[PDB]
Design a protein around this ligand. Structure first.
Ligand SMILES: Fc1ccc(CSc2nnc[nH]2)cc1
Ligand SMILES: [Cl-]
Ligand code: NI
Ligand code: NI
Ligand code: NI
Length: 284
């Protein structure tokens, strides 16, 4: 048997960032300056995003390595935070529209945007950790769902098939392809198992800004005319649900949970469209 429905715990004090680390503009402001930037990056921007992406990948791997029964989500945040700052990177979530931590930790029925807190991870949980680094004036964004101890077959297959859906979408990235093929591949794969792909949350262009206005749908909608072009950088980050798509937000205003409390899994990479195919920027 698995755990029952989560409730919110208490947050640790705000984690400090040394002053020599440049803040993204939106830290300390109610909203962010983003959503109207070019989608294709310059070679110099792409080189800085390789750095940001590899640091984020490091933070995710170190926090992921710690996922185990007994560990709290706040403990995962401390590991991510420290990895980012010791690498000279600002954690993009920290202060983003007031978000109070340095990564999102979303267990079980939490679709996304779980706030690291006193919540204790337990056997059979699935723990998504989503972390973004801001360094060299650019962002790199990545996430993965990690099993804690032995997970029930249905939840283990949900995680594995979500990771496979994500890799299948990434391997469709190639200049000239409609961006829509990503959602077509993800949803067709998910529907084999009777899963539902979340529609209200999407992937996004990313560059000097965290969400540059480019939207990447994870469901099938071929009316979108956008084509993948060399130099474009965006995320693929499908959330796939065992149950229905209906959701609710906690009183904290951030934590997004499935209304029927059935579990959900997500993976995410920041990608570059190259002249021949794709490069994953959030790689170790
Ligand atoms: F409003 C928020 C709060 C936290 C995040 C970081 S999780 C995430 N990574 N790609 C999309 N979302 C993003 C937006
Ligand atoms: Cl989002
Ligand atoms: Ni998000
Ligand atoms: Ni993310
Ligand atoms: Ni993202």
């Amino acid at each position: 048997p698995s755990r029952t429905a989560l409730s919110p715990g208490v947050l640790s004090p705000t984690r400090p960032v040394p002053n020599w680390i440049a803040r993204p503009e939106y830290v300390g402001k109610p909203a962010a300056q983003e959503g109207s930037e070019p989608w294709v990056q310059t070679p110099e921007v792409i080189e800085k995003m390789r750095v940001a992406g590899r640091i984020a990948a490091g933070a995710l791997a170190e926090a992921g390595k710690a996922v185990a029964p007994g560990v709290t989500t706040d403990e995962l945040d401390r590991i991510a935070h420290e990895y980012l700052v010791d690498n000279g990177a600002y954690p993009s979530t920290l202060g983003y529209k007031g978000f109070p931590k340095s990564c999102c930790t979303s267990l079980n029925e939490v679709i996304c945007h779980g706030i690291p807190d006193s919540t204790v991870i337990t056997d059979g949980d699935i723990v998504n950790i989503d972390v973004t680094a801001y360094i060299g004036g650019v962002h790199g964004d990545t996430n993965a769902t990690f099993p804690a101890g032995d997970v029930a077959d249905e939840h283990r297959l949900l995680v594995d098939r979500t990771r496979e859906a994500t890799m299948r979408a990434i391997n469709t990235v190639k200049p000239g392809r409609a961006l829509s093929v990503i959602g077509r591949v993800i949803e067709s794969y998910a529907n084999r198992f009777g899963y539902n792909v979340v529609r209200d949350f999407t992937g996004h262009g990313i560059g000097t800004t965290f969400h540059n206005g480019l939207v990447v749908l994870h469901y099938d909608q071929p009316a979108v005319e956008t084509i993948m072009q060399p130099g474009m950088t965006f995320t693929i980050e499908p959330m796939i649900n065992l149950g229905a798509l209906d959701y609710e937000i906690w009183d904290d205003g951030w934590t997004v949970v499935t209304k029927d409390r059935k579990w959900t899994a997500q993976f995410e990479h920041t990608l570059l469209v190259t002249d021949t195919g794709v490069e994953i920027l959030t790689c170790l």
